[PDB]
């Protein structure tokens, strides 16, 4: 399997897929020589925090007699780099035993019982095909595309993050609330952007809203496409633009807009880039300031920050990702030679600088959902069971499909006092939080202020609440902008 | 495939393909015919014989993925990690 992993042996092994990097190098393959491996470049401290959340949840479970006593969980976690190829290498590593059983030599091959991942929706799609081939349950924490709700193609996919339908409906509701009818749309050319933007188009057509332009962007877009999109935006008179894209896939466009200093546009953000550091830095506040975006419900993991502050490139021997984390955080090489004596608090990174735990809580919940499924496997009365003749699966000889069956019939309680279940499409329902981008008076950074919410449990037309007294349009103005194609006709 | 929904009360078993597509059989015969014509023609690739391993997809991702895993067995062993009986596939036609 791939190297730089994070491995720890136990009785039961969980798989993991996290974006420790933002993306792989763009070196073209001329194919004049045998193709080599591809190198990942930008270090993602947020993905490393998510990985640490999974490891922390596993350690917490392993220390609690209330959950799975006399059994030790293990983990084999790899990096995806927001790329299908790396994730597929890791997944081929995951299913080696099952794959060789199906197609056809060491017995030491550890068998993954369940996988946690991945972030993207295309990556999750490929991994879901491969894992559903063998009925290995896959519980994702960040993939929210509606295409993954299809159970005829994805038999063993589960989510602790809500679907994107309510979010598109929410964007339509927000646009209707402020009396706009002339907007524009931008989306990423992937499995996440296109379904969401199509749902928004349908809802806007239902709510009497006209759309001027519809453009598609990617993180690998050439110059020609970027200038085409920028010119399309610039010619349009619509000031409100709806974006379904991630941070990595939107950065080139925002950079080019900042180069031409295009102002006066209202940015409606999706959950993928409404809190992204690649878009929210203070050198773009003259373009992306005043952005209205969505956020997930936060979570409380007691003792998570203290665990995060115990990372050390020598003490942490199970996490093979700690060395590069240290090198990047302190810009040293173990460039000044590292000493392994400094404080993570000294350097300001997304690792420790955060306010809410939303995706990290999703990873926490995914791990605990698998754990509670295993617990229900353990505490099984022989008379009543989910399998043939109401029997129970042997906890010592548990198989992946049995874990899948228990996850399909799962109902447990969080540490925060909430009921966790999955629907027929293996989806989970959650609120939304509306945020607006303000400038920090002291540090000069970008502050995320809550301005309202979206109640998915309410009735249609009553789910949105916004407090426009807290909104600052373009970051400074208290006057709601005008985004109608024509001026309203007066009397007569 | 046969839409026999599985409730996972027993170990899942391989799905069953239902209707017969004669047109796909004609396409497969076209592939075989092309390979045989190439082998017989000495003008193209002399002193060399092309083989083939053709599977069924049933318009289903799972079947094609099993066939593809069969296709990449040797490369999979080289990357992830015995016998040399595994034949390397140069190119795949489909789907
Ligand atoms: C922009 O156009 C919208 C049309 O959708 C206007 O909203 C309508 O305003 C009239 C005026 O009373 C209401 O009767 C309608 O119910 C509104 N329709 C909605 C909200 O969908 C809006 O007023 C226009 N804005 C400006 C500044 O002219
Ligand atoms: C989503 O948000 C709404 C509004 O904040 C929550 O509804 C509130 O729930 C609390 C109790 O949890 C009540 O005291 C309030 O009266 C409710 N407000 C309403 C109904 O407008 C709702 O519980 C949230 N959904 C969750 C947490 O899953
Ligand atoms: O399905 C997808 O691709 C997105 C990816 C994504 C979401 N939220 C995020 C936050 C940070 C980074 C990435 C994401 C929502 N699901
Ligand atoms: C925008 O308008 C200018 C002026 O007519 C034109 O040259 C340009 O092609 C337009 N951009 C697009 C994307 O159509
Ligand atoms: C960008 O345009 C705004 C609008 O006038 C202006 O205030 C700002 O100084 C400009 N910045 C640059 C770098 O040109
Ligand atoms: C889950 O269990 C709780 C009891 O803690 C119950 O109130 C709730 O209705 C159950 N939900 C489902 C979907 O079974
Ligand atoms: Ca990913
Ligand atoms: Ca980010």
From Swiss-Prot, chain B:
The extracellular regions of the homodimer interact in a side-by-side fashion while facing opposite directions. Each extracellular region consists of three domains, LB1 (ligand-binding 1), LB2 and CR (cysteine-rich). The two lobe-shaped domains LB1 and LB2 form a venus flytrap module. In the inactive configuration, the venus flytrap modules of both protomers are in the open conformation associated with the resting state (open-open) and the interdomain cleft is empty. In addition, each protomer contains three anions, which reinforce the inactive conformation, and one calcium ion. This is Extracellular calcium-sensing receptor. Phosphate binds at residues 23-27. Changing residue 67 to T: In HHC1; decreased G-protein coupled receptor signaling pathway. Glycans are attached at residue 47. It is found in: Cell membrane. Changing residue 38 to M: In HHC1; decreased G-protein coupled receptor signaling pathway. The chain holds residues 44 to 144 of 1078 of the full protein. The lineage of its organism: Eukaryota, Metazoa, Chordata, Craniata, Vertebrata. Changing residue 12 to L: In HHC1; decreased G-protein coupled receptor signaling pathway.
């Amino acid at each position: 399997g791939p190297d730089q992993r994070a491995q720890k042996k136990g009785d039961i092994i969980l798989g993991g897929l996290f974006p420790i990097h933002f993306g792989v190098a763009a070196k073209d393959q001329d194919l004049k020589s045998r193709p080599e491996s591809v190198e990942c470049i930008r270090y993602n401290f947020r993905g490393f925090r998510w990985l640490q959340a999974m490891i922390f949840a596993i350690e917490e479970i392993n220390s609690s007699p209330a959950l799975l006593p006399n059994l030790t969980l293990g983990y084999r976690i790899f990096d995806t780099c927001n790329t299908v190829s790396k994730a597929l290498e890791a997944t081929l590593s995951f299913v080696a035993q099952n794959k060789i059983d199906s197609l056809n030599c060491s017995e030491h091959i550890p068998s993954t019982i369940a996988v946690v991942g991945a972030t993207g929706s295309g990556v999750s799609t490929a991994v879901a095909n491969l894992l559903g081939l063998f009925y290995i349950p896959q519980v994702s924490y960040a993939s929210s595309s509606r295409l993954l709700s299809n159970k005829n193609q994805f038999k063993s996919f589960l989510r602790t993050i809500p679907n994107d339908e309510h979010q598109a409906t929410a964007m339509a509701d927000i646009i209707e609330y402020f009396r706009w009818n002339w907007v524009g749309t931008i989306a990423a050319d992937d499995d996440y952007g296109r379904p969401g933007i199509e749902k928004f188009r349908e809802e806007a057509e239902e709510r009497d809203i006209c759309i001027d332009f519809s453009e598609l962007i990617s993180q690998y877009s050439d110059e020609e496409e970027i200038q085409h999109v920028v010119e399309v935006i610039q010619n349009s008179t619509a000031k409100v633009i709806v974006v379904f894209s991630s941070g990595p896939d939107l950065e080139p466009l925002i950079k080019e807009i900042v180069r031409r200093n295009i102002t006066g546009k209202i940015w409606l953000a999706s959950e993928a880039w409404a809190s992204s550091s690649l878009i929210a830095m203070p050198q773009y506040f003259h373009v992306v300031g005043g952005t209205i975006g969505f956020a997930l419900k936060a979570g409380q993991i007691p003792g998570f920050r203290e665990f995060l502050k115990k990372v050390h490139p020598r003490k942490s021997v199970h996490n093979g990702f700690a060395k590069e984390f240290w090198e990047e955080t302190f810009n040293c090489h173990l460039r000044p030679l590292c000493t392994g004596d400094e404080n993570i608090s000294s350097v300001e990174t997304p690792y420790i600088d955060y306010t809410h735990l939303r995706i990290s809580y999703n990873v926490y919940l995914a791990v605990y959902s698998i754990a509670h499924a295993l617990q229900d496997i353990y505490t099984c009365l022989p008379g009543r069971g989910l399998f043939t003749n109401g029997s129970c699966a042997d906890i010592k000889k548990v198989e992946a499909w049995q874990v899948l069956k228990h996850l399909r019939h799962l109902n447990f309680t969080n540490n925060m006092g909430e009921q966790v279940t999955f629907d027929e499409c293996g989806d989970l329902v959650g609120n939304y939080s509306i945020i607006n981008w303000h400038l920090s008076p002291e540090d000069g950074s970008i502050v995320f202020k809550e301005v309202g919410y979206y109640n998915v449990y309410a009735k249609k037309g009553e789910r949105l609440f916004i407090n426009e007294e807290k909104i600052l349009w373009s970051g400074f103005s208290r006057e709601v902008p005008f985004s109608n194609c024509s001026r309203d006709c007066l009397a007569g």
